[PDB]
Every structure is written in C-alpha cells, then in structure tokens.
RNA sequence: AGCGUGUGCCUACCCUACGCCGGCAGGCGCGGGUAACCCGUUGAACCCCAUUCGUGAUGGGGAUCGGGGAUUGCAAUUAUUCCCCAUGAACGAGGAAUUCCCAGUAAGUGCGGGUCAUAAGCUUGCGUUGAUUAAGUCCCUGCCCUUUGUACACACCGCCCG
RNA sequence: AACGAGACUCUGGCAUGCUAACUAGUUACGCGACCCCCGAGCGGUCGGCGUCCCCCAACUUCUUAGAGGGACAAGUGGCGU
C-alpha cells in the first residue's frame, strides 16, 4: 500500500522500532543533554527520541518535494512561552536535524538530489511502502 | 509493595521519599529540574520511580556524579559557574556553599564600591528597572 | 365554550362535522399502511366476513378478546383491537392504534390554525383539543390503553378549503407512547374500573331484560332504566 | 394549625399577548385560558419571552395582575 | 435507524417529554436527531429560531464558559461523549431520558423580579415562560460540574454525570435542585 | 453537632445564626442554634426603614438573632426573618 | 486549600481491598480510587492497568485525559 | 490559513532558500528575487492524538537575583537586544465602585504592517476556533420634538436670603 | 425653493452566463520513469499513490479581473383611512 492509506500515529511507532533493530542510524554523542528546541523548557522524557524523529523525517520527504535543514526545523517548531511577555512562535534546533539527515544519507535512504534539497532514494521509498502494509497486517485496516 | 523507607536526609537539605527521584532532588539549591534529568542518566538509573526506592549504594554514586561533572562528561556550559572570577575554573556549587559564594560577590562589589554594591546596600533594584511605580512595602 | 348550534343543513353542524370526522378517521388508518406489502396474519382469520373475500378490501384490524376481573367474581370478556403494526428492529415490531384529528375552521370555535403554529406551538395545538374535544382525546387514549399499544399515532388533517367539507389534506403525523402520554394528559384508569364496577352494582341484582343506560341530552347524569322488553 | 394545605399544580395556556410592562419592559401582560375551562380567563404577568399558544405552569390562580 | 440518525450509538426513539407544558421547546427526535451536535452557525437571527436547535447541542454550548474555555467547542464534545457513557454504566437507562428529567426537574415554577417603589427594594412574584425554564435549567446544572472540578481530582465528565443523576431524581445534592427551590421559597414570601 | 433539644426549629421561635455568606436576595446563613443546617433570610424582612450602608448592618462572622418564619419539615428549608426581633429576645 | 492524605505505594489493607472492591463497584476510574481509599491517584492509574491484564476489569473507553473501566461486563 | 512586505531606496542599506560548523544565540560558503516569476504549494498558533505529573503555593506562577556565552554600533556602565545554567517571590479569584459588547459578533489564539543601526507588553490591519443572552423599555444616564412656568441670558456650575 | 437626511462612492454576499490567461490552474492522454501487490490478475495490464515528463493537446469549473445581469416591499396572506 501507499503510506497515505494508514494512520500516521501508528506509522512512526513501528518505523522507529524497525530502524533500531537493524543497527541503523549512527547517533550523535549529545542526546542526553539536549533541550531539543529553543522554545522548550525541558529535555524529552523519551530516551530514544532520535529514532522517533528520523521516522517523521523520512515520511515528510515521501509527501513533499524535499527540502533542507532549515525547512525541517520550521515543520517541527512550535510556541514559545516567554513568561510575562506574550507567547510567539519560533524555530527549534538545527544541529540535531543536520545529524539526522546525514545519518539517513549514510544508509542511502536519502540523497542530495537536484533542486535545493535532499530527496528519498528509491530503496528508501521501497522500505516505507513495505512496512506500510505491515501496519495493516498487524491490527487490521 | 516496597515499604522499605521514605523520608531521608542527604547533604544540607532533607529530601522526601514521597516524590519522584528527579523532582525530589531539585529542593537542594544549585540543582534545578533541568540539571537533575541529566545527572540521573549519567548515573544510568530509573527516574520512573520514587526517591524512597533508591538504595544507599545508588545515592552514594549520585553525589559523586554531581560534584565532579566535568570528569563524568557533562559539558562546561551546562554548569552554574564558568570561571567564577578570581578562582580560575569552572565550578558547580551546591546548597550551603552557594550562599557563601553569593555573599562574597556582594561584598566584592562594595569593596571596589561600584554602582552595583551601592544599589545593593541601599536596597534598590540592580538591573535597569524603574522604581517610580515599582515597590511599596509604604504609601 | 359553546359548541356549534348550526342545523343539519350546514357543514359546520354537530352532525356534518361528525360525518366529516368519522369519514376521514378510518380512511387515513389504511393510508398509513402498505396493503401491497406482507401482512402479519393470526391463525384465526376475521369472523365478521368470509375468507372468500379475496379483494383485501377489509380494514387492517385484528380483534383481541381479552380477560379482566373487577372483583365481586366478575369476568369481563371484551373485544379490543389495533389498527396497524409498524416495523421495529431486532425482530420486534410496534403495535399502533391510529386515529385522526380533523379540523373545519380555526376561528369559529376558538382554536389554533395548525398550519401556522404546529412546529412552534406543538403543545398548544394539543391543548386546544383538551378544551374542545377532551371527550374524544381520552376516548381514543382509553382504547389505546385497552389495547396495550406500543405507539399511539395521530394524523393532523384539516379542510383543504374551509367552505368545502369534502376536500382535506394531511399536514403531519406524530408518534407518542400511549402510557407516558397518559402520564402527560392526566388520565388514569384506576378511576375507570370503578365506573364500570358501579354500573354492574345495579344490573346484577336485577333480573334479565333490555335495560337502557344512556346519557341525558340536556343534563349531566346517566341512569339505568327498566323497560318493558322489546321496546 | 400546622403549615398549610395547598392546591395542586395548574396548567393554563396563552390565548393572546397584550403588551409589555414593568419599569424596564421586563414583565409582560398576557391573557391566558385556564385549559380546563374555556370561558374562564385571567390576566397574568409573565417574565420570560413568550409567543402565543404556549402553556405555563401556575401555582395558583388566586393571584391576578393589574398594572403594578 | 437507516432514515434517522442515532447519536453515534444512542437511540432518540424511546425518548419522551413527560410534560405537555414544556414540549415544543424540548424536542430531540422529530427529525432533529443527528449524529453529532453541531451547526453551520445558524442558531439565532429571530426569537423563534433559538428553540429549534437540539437540546443536546444547547447543553454543549452552555458548557464552555469563563474565559479559557471559550472557542473550544471540540474539546467540549469530548466531555459529553464520556457523560452519556458514564450515565449508562452507572445506572442503566436510555441516558437521554436522564437528561430530559434533569432539565424538567430543574426549571422553576415561579420566579421573582424587581419593582421600584419609594426608592427602596420591593419584589414582585411573576411566572416564567417554558423557554425561560429550559434556558435556566441548562444554565444551572452546567454551573455545578464547573464548580466541583475546580479543585477536585475528579474530572468534569464524572462531575457532570453525577449532577444529572441528582437532578433527574431530586435529592438536593446538586447545585441545580437546591437553587431552584431557593427561588420558589422567595416567590412564596413576596407575592 | 446539635446544640438544642429539638433537631429542627419550630414556627415563630427565636433562634441564633452565624452569617457565612451574603446573598443578593437576603442572606443564606448557617445555624449555631441548632445543627449546621441551612436557613435563608430575605432582604425585605430585615428592617422597616431605609438602608444606606449594607456591611454596617449584616456581615459575615456575626451572631444575629432572628425568628423562624416557616420551615419545610421534609425538605429542610428553614425560612428565616430578622424583622420581628426585640432586645429582650436577644 | 486543605490537607488530604495519600499513599504512593500500597500496604496490606489497601491492596487486599483492591481485589474485592472490583465486583462490588460497577464504575471504576482512578478518581474514584482517590476517595474510597487514600491513594495518590497516579498509583491508581497503573494499578488498573495491572488488573486489566488479569481480566478482573474491562476497558470500555479510553482517552488521553480520561479513562473508564468497568466491573467485568456481566449482567 | 490570510492581509501584507522585501536589496537596486537617504547617503549605505533588504527578504532569504540551499550547503557546512555549533547545545543555543550565532558564524561561514554559495544562489535567487524590480517581485501571481524568488523567499512562500507562506509545511503558524489555539485545536487534534499518545505518555508523565496528582489537589500539594505542587512540576501551578516566573517576579527577584548570581555567573557565563553571542549579535548591533563610533561607544552598551544606571545591566540596548538575544541565548545557557542557577536562584524561585507575590499570587489559591479578588472591597467600595466601574468599563465594553447583539452575529462569523463577544471571548480564546497566532500573524503582517507602522517606529527600527540593535528592540514591542503599544497602535493599526488580517486570518483561524467561535458561545450564552435580548428581539425590549424610559428606571437610571443622556438626547430630539411640542406644551407650560421663570426674579435666569456670564443662561441653575444659574440666581438669591438672614 | 435650497442645504443636511436619502441619493452617491468603496466593500461583502449570488453566476458551471459573457470576456482570456506557460508571471494562473484544471482535465486529458501521450507517456516513459519510481514505488508496493496493495485489490482482480502474476510482477504486466486494469485500479490506487505523488513527482519528473508534459504538448504543436483540450478546457477556464477552481485562481485571477474586466464588462454585464440579479432584490424592487416583487408575489401571496393579514393589517392600515
């Protein structure tokens, strides 16, 4: 199936687990000291947040035409509570997303293609739709 | 289950076994919530249970991982103090030493008698703030 | 307040309106219903006509003959009925007595024009006929409670043209549950069975004979007459 | 001797609306038919927005309205 | 059922209005049963137009109040789906008949108002519309659950389903049936 | 608990209350002359003269003498009044 | 404010009652465990997750912010 | 999701994609845009879905305050602005009084423009989510028209008595 | 008779009518390429998913902005001299 058919809350939670089994993703050392965005006030509860976020990275590339380190951050950014000052939007971290996308590219599930952005490899696109049916196999769509 | 112990004393502040581990530790000054969720993970223990469920062997390691943070590879920028000033090093300050350190810097800025110590001694706001409509104790 | 006192040559009279009303009330009982579709059949067919009536131009009706006791070793065995059954779900169905509320003119009897006021003042319309036809309302409800209907259906019908007592038009239908309806209209049958008791207190101690129980045409009182028989 | 014996809950319906009264227009004069007697009618003061033909719930019909 | 919507699971058949007074301003099943309570945003541009829209929707509207909850009608519908669910498990009924009793038992029979005489407060007893009763009864019980959950561990869903029970069977443990009787107790005095 | 021989007050008896809230329509008050049962005072029957201030009359945290005008025995509504009070009763 | 007592882990009487309160109560939410017993409330959340794995309770609805559980779904 | 805006202008200056380096602020290398053409298929917030906390001045609240890192400028001390760690106050629904509002309206929520070398808790516009209550009245406050009375016309805030 | 009110100007709401568009789209194939059998079938094809390919294709519903039309108390029932 196409990844469109299935729920997406389910998609990531099986795709994150998939990667961590296969020895995939060489992770940065900083992963236990990282706020993760400028608009947070705390570190994540999750201890495998890197695996989770790489799932959501590869999915969006399937849909849209692909874009760099800047655009990924804009997709993830949220609201910043400035305390006594009124809240405003802001963008999160960059150097995390710059490690994510290069780690994917090491596995050749993405690659720097033309028109100013990484795009997902046919090998990558194969692997997405492969586990997309595994979701329907599991529960029952 | 797990009836073994509850409220305890650690260095300089009494910490309850009632609360979760990270949030329990924050009561000690010089340690915020952000500082504790790091130090627990360097210690490689759960933060998903109560502070009364820690053993003596475990908490003995906690204070060591806390008070030598550079040697357990917590970055320098993540400390309270970087080059204190006139002491020459990166430092991490905890409960009763924090107050002692703090009182020194007040004394220093009246020693030289900068603008700072005068504002301190007069009991007026240090930073750029209006005091015309701010305060009252008086009226 | 003061009923129509018009003569029998007039449309709006007691007789012609009762003709009008009784003419329509059974016409719509069958218009509710699908005579070209399956009937539920009792093993006993109608005993008021033969089964050589193959037209199916009998009314939709079946006749319960039922048991009651009023005390004093009395055994009432009386005909009761339904007019239509409505498809439910889960193999169940809803028995219905159907009756029909006619109208002739709003403004000659201190009534409500239902066309203007059905949706907004749904309750006021039914309150009209607790002042103008309260006799007929509880009469119909008594029949529905005698039957033990699942839904009490009524039809709103009025004259198509208020000077033409022949042409009429359906305006709406509304299903009520007869027993919660009886809780609403302030009707109770505990009273009712002492009425029929009190009439049987007379006739039983009397001997056989054509005795007449009637209502006086100009006074509010009923009686039991002993007549020379065959009169 | 003790407390009181009171009449049961009555129901009476509008026949016509008359006009609004009170010192901010908050009260409404209305004519109502007793809903058991069709020649009986009382005038009332009713607070809420009313149309015509709707039914009220009177606790007594001893009370009667005038103007103030 | 295939020609008339339920509520997503709850029948609007076997639902009655047990007054003759307050029907034609309580309706829920004539054809007004729908899968969800929502509107396109027509609800009022005439005085009569208010009446038509469902009772279940009216309940959802008056549930979101006091600043932080305004303009969050979807969050509000979450509380209502749990309410009926809790009411059905807890007592076992068609859980709409609960609500209809709860509305009818909370509406006042007589009410007071003000009248100006001598520059001093005097009060006058007056009657109340059926449309007023419905509006008041929906207001009163929604204030109860809002009040209770302001420092309780209990969620608003739990509080609200409790409040419809004690209204549907009068017991004076609700904020509604209390406050109803307060008004009538005044209306007896000055009359 | 109850401070009095009967649990519920009668009709026309002198009692005492302690104000715990001030209402628009009068004063809703707790008893301390009986159980902590609720009793409602009404605005009309507090005085026979004008009233400028309002907190220089009735206010929270005051023992006030009053007369029980009516009681619903079954419901537990103790209607109350401060209109008929004499200093001798106080 | 006020002071209310709570317990973050079980002792004998709480735990033993917890197994026998189930058939006696039709509605079961973590909030109701807060009042009938003196229990934190977060303790009651995970306590009910345990019971569902035994099948001593039944799920009937679930959400992010509120969760309902029932006796055994029998009648 | 929408109204807009953008260097080639004032005298020295714009909006930013993409690549690389850094926890972050930020730095650095390249490219486009005179603009329904490039930024931007403006991949915004509330909302929605799943964990954690548990009635506790609590992890609610973020005032006060210590140390350190960046950016603008000729210069940042009485802290220009921004970021990181630590410190953790009042405040637990508010007296006498009083403001504003009738349908995509009130309220919640974000964004663009304006001032701008650096910088909105302001103002001006725009989208998004979206109720309750009324269909009235002259009671208060005030205004329009007629009639009436006046020692007033600097007009009742007027005028005037012992 | 004149000024103000109204009339007027702008804006919103109604067009599968009109006008015309690679600095705006849609549809249609031509497609070839990628993808998974995910459904009939076998993987092809038919169907589904977006992107590149798109034209000397077709069209202007959506988007854009111009010319026009449409609402007048017009029709019906009450009420008012």
Swiss-Prot record, chain A:
Gene Ontology molecular function, alphabetical: RNA binding; structural constituent of ribosome
Primary localization class, coarse: cytoplasm
Location in the cell: Cytoplasm; Nucleus, Nucleolus
Residues found modified as N6-succinyllysine: 140
Database matches in SUPFAM superfamilies: Winged helix' DNA-binding domain
Keywords: Acetylation, Cytoplasm, Host-virus interaction, Methylation, Nucleus, Ribonucleoprotein, Ribosomal protein
Pfam families: Ribosomal_S19e (PF01090)
Residue numbers carrying N6-acetyllysine: 20, 108, 112
GO annotation, biological process: ribosomal small subunit assembly; translation
Residue numbers of Omega-N-methylarginine PTMs: 64
Entries under InterPro entries matching the protein: Ribosomal_eS19 (IPR001266), Ribosomal_eS19_CS (IPR018277), WH-like_DNA-bd_sf (IPR036388), WH_DNA-bd_sf (IPR036390)
GO CC annotations, alphabetized: cytosolic ribosome; cytosolic small ribosomal subunit; nucleolus
Coiled-coil ranges (or none): none
Stated family: Belongs to the eukaryotic ribosomal protein eS19 family.
Task performed by this protein: Component of the small ribosomal subunit. The ribosome is a large ribonucleoprotein complex responsible for the synthesis of proteins in the cell. Required for pre-rRNA processing and maturation of 40S ribosomal subunits. Part of the small subunit (SSU) processome, first precursor of the small eukaryotic ribosomal subunit.
Oligomeric and partner information: Component of the small ribosomal subunit. Part of the small subunit (SSU) processome, composed of more than 70 proteins and the RNA chaperone small nucleolar RNA (snoRNA) U3. Interacts with RPS19BP1; the interaction is direct and mediates the integration of RPS19 in state post-A1. Interacts with RPS19BP1.
Name of the protein this chain belongs to: Small ribosomal subunit protein eS19
Gene that encodes the chain: RPS19
From Swiss-Prot, chain B:
Record-listed N6-acetyllysine modification sites: 89, 101
Cross-link (Glycyl lysine isopeptide (Lys-Gly) (interchain with G-Cter in SUMO2)): 86, 89, 101
Main subcellular location: cytoplasm
An annotated Gene Ontology molecular function: structural constituent of ribosome
Intrachain disulfide bonds: none
Entries under SUPFAM superfamilies matching the protein: S13-like H2TH domain
Keywords: Acetylation, Cytoplasm, Isopeptide bond, Ribonucleoprotein, Ribosomal protein, RNA-binding, rRNA-binding, Ubl conjugation
Locations listed in the record: Cytoplasm
Signal peptide boundaries: none
Superkingdom field: Eukaryota
GO biological process terms held by the UniProt record: translation
GO cellular component, one term: cytosolic ribosome
Family statement drawn from the similarity comment of this UniProt entry: Belongs to the universal ribosomal protein uS13 family.
PANTHER family named among the record's database cross-references: 30S RIBOSOMAL PROTEIN S13/40S RIBOSOMAL PROTEIN S18, SMALL RIBOSOMAL SUBUNIT PROTEIN US13
Assembly with partners or alone: Component of the small ribosomal subunit.
Job description of the protein: Component of the small ribosomal subunit. The ribosome is a large ribonucleoprotein complex responsible for the synthesis of proteins in the cell.
Protein name: Small ribosomal subunit protein uS13
Organism this protein belongs to: Oryctolagus cuniculus (Rabbit)
From Swiss-Prot, chain D:
Pfam family name, one: Ribosomal_S28e
Cellular localization per UniProt: Cytoplasm, Cytosol; Cytoplasm; Rough endoplasmic reticulum; Nucleus, Nucleolus
GO-annotated biological processes: cytoplasmic translation; maturation of SSU-rRNA; ribosomal small subunit assembly
Alphabetical keyword list: Acetylation, Cytoplasm, Endoplasmic reticulum, Nucleus, Phosphoprotein, Ribonucleoprotein, Ribosomal protein
Gene Ontology terms: cellular component: cytosolic ribosome; cytosolic small ribosomal subunit; nucleolus; rough endoplasmic reticulum; small-subunit processome; synapse
Broad class of where this protein is predominantly found: cytoplasm
Modified residues (Phosphoserine): 41
Record keyword Phosphoprotein present: yes
GO-annotated molecular function: structural constituent of ribosome
Residues recorded as bearing N-acetylmethionine in the entry: 1
Keyword Phosphoprotein: yes
Assembly, per entry: Component of the 40S small ribosomal subunit. Part of the small subunit (SSU) processome, composed of more than 70 proteins and the RNA chaperone small nucleolar RNA (snoRNA) U3.
Family membership: Belongs to the eukaryotic ribosomal protein eS28 family.
Name this protein carries in UniProt: Small ribosomal subunit protein eS28
Source species of the chain: Oryctolagus cuniculus (Rabbit)
Curated annotation (Swiss-Prot), chain G:
Function summary: Component of the small ribosomal subunit. The ribosome is a large ribonucleoprotein complex responsible for the synthesis of proteins in the cell.
Superkingdom field: Eukaryota
Any one Gene Ontology BP term: ribosomal small subunit biogenesis
Subcellular localization, as worded in the UniProt entry: Cytoplasm
Alphabetically ordered keywords of this record: Acetylation, Cytoplasm, Ribonucleoprotein, Ribosomal protein
Quaternary assembly: Component of the small ribosomal subunit.
Predominant cellular place of this UniProt entry's protein: cytoplasm
Location of N6-succinyllysine modifications: 12, 54
GO cellular component term of the entry, any: cytosolic ribosome
Organism: Oryctolagus cuniculus (Rabbit)
GO molecular function: structural constituent of ribosome
Family statement drawn from the similarity comment of this UniProt entry: Belongs to the eukaryotic ribosomal protein eS25 family.
Post-translational modification N6-acetyllysine, affected residues: 3, 12, 20, 26, 54
Protein name according to UniProt: Small ribosomal subunit protein eS25
């Amino acid at each position: 199936v196409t990844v469109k058919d299935v729920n997406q809350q389910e998609f990531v939670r099986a795709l994150a687990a998939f990667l961590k089994k296969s020895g995939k993703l060489k992770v940065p050392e900083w992963v236990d000291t990282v706020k993760l965005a400028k608009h947070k006030e705390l570190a994540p509860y999750d201890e495998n947040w890197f695996y989770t976020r790489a799932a959501s990275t590869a999915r969006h590339l399937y849909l849209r035409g692909g874009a760099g380190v800047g655009s990924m951050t804009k997709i993830y950014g949220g609201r910043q509570r400035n305390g006594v000052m009124p809240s405003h939007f802001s963008r999160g971290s960059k150097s995390v997303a710059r490690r994510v996308l290069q780690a994917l590219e090491g596995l050749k599930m993405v690659e720097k293609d033309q028109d100013w952005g990484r795009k997902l490899t046919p090998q990558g696109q194969r692997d997405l739709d492969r586990i997309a049916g595994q979701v329907a196999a599991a529960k029952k769509k | 289950p797990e009836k073994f112990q509850h409220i305890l004393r650690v260095l300089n502040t009494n910490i309850d076994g009632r609360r979760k581990i990270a949030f329990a530790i924050t009561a000690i000054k010089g340690v915020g919530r952000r500082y504790a969720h790091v130090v627990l993970r360097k210690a490689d223990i759960d933060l998903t249970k109560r502070a009364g469920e820690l053993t003596e062997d475990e908490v003995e390691r906690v204070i060591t991982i806390m008070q030598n943070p550079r040697q357990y590879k917590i970055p320098d920028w993540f400390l309270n103090r970087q080059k204190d000033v006139k002491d020459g090093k990166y430092s991490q300050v905890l409960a009763n030493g924090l107050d002692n350190k703090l009182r020194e810097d007040l004394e220093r800025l009246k020693k030289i008698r900068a603008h700072r110590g005068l504002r301190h001694f007069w009991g007026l706001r240090v930073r750029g703030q209006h005091t015309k409509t701010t305060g009252r104790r008086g009226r | 307040n003061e009923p129509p006192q018009d003569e029998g040559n007039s449309f709006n009279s007691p007789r012609n309106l009762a003709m009008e009303a009784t003419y329509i009330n059974h016409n719509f009982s069958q218009q509710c219903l699908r005579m070209g579709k399956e009937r539920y059949n009792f093993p006993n067919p109608n005993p008021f006509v033969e089964d050589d009536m193959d037209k199916n131009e009998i009314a939709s009706v079946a006749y319960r003959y039922r048991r009651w006791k009023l005390g004093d070793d009395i055994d009432l065995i009386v005909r009761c009925e339904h007019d239509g059954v409505m498809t439910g779900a889960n193999g169940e169905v809803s028995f219905i007595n159907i009756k029909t509320l006619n109208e002739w003119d709003s403004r000659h009897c201190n009534g409500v024009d239902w066309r203007q006021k059905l949706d907004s003042q749904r309750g006021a319309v039914i309150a009209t006929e607790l002042k103008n036809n309260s006799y007929k309302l509880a009469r119909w409800t008594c029949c529905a409670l005698l039957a033990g209907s699942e839904y009490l259906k009524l039809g709103y019908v009025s004259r198509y043209h208020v000077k033409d007592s022949s042409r009429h038009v359906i305006l709406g239908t509304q299903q009520f549950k007869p027993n919660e309806f009886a809780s609403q209209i302030n009707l109770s049958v505990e009273n009712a069975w002492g009425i029929l008791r009190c009439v049987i207190d007379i006739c039983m101690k009397l001997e056989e004979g054509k005795y007449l129980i009637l209502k006086d045409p100009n006074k509010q009182v009923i009686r039991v007459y002993s007549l020379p028989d065959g009169t | 001797m003790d407390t009181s014996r009171v009449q049961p809950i009555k129901l009476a319906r509008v026949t016509k609306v008359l006009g609004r009264t009170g010192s901010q227009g908050q009260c409404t004069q209305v004519r109502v038919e007793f809903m058991d007697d069709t020649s009986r009618s009382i005038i009332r003061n009713v607070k809420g927005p009313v149309r015509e033909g709707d039914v009220l719930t009177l606790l007594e019909s001893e009370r009667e309205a005038r103007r103030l | 059922t295939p020609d008339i919507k339920l509520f997503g699971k709850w029948s609007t058949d076997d639902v009655q209005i047990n007054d003759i007074s307050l029907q034609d301003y309580i309706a829920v099943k004539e054809k007004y049963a729908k899968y969800l309570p929502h509107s396109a945003g027509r609800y009022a541009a005439k005085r009569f137009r208010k009446a038509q829209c469902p009772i279940v929707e009216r309940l959802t509207n008056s549930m979101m109040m006091h600043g932080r909850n305004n303009g969050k009608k979807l969050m509000t519908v979450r509380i209502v789906k749990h309410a009926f669910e809790i009411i059905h498990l807890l007592t076992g009924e068609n859980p709409l008949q609960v609500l209809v009793n709860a509305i009818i038992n909370s509406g006042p029979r007589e009410d007071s108002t003000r009248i100006g005489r001598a520059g001093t407060v005097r009060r006058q007893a007056v009657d109340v519309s059926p449309l007023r009763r419905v509006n008041q009864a929906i207001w009163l019980l929604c204030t109860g659950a809002r009040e209770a959950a302001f420092r309780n561990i209990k969620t608003i869903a739990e509080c609200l389903a409790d409040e419809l029970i004690n209204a549907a069977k009068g017991s004076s443990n609700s904020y509604a049936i209390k406050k109803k009787d307060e008004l009538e107790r005044v209306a007896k005095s000055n009359r | 608990c109850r401070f009095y021989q009967h649990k519920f007050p009668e009709v026309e008896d002198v009692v005492m209350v302690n104000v715990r809230s001030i209402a628009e329509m009068g004063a809703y008050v707790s008893l301390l002359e009986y159980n902590n049962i609720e009793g409602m005072i009404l605005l009309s029957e507090l005085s026979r003269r004008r009233i400028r201030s309002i907190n220089k009359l009735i206010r929270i945290g005051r023992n006030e003498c009053v007369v029980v005008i009516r009681v619903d025995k079954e419901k537990g509504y103790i209607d109350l009044s401060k209109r008929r009070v004499s200093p001798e009763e106080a | 404010r006020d002071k209310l007592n709570n317990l973050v882990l079980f002792d004998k009487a709480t735990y033993d009652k917890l197994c026998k309160e189930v058939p006696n109560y039709k509605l079961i939410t973590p909030a109701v465990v807060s009042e009938r017993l003196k229990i934190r409330g977060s303790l009651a959340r995970a306590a009910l997750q345990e019971l569902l794995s035994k099948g001593l309770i039944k799920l009937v609805s679930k959400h992010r912010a509120q969760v309902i559980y029932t006796r055994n779904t029998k009648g």
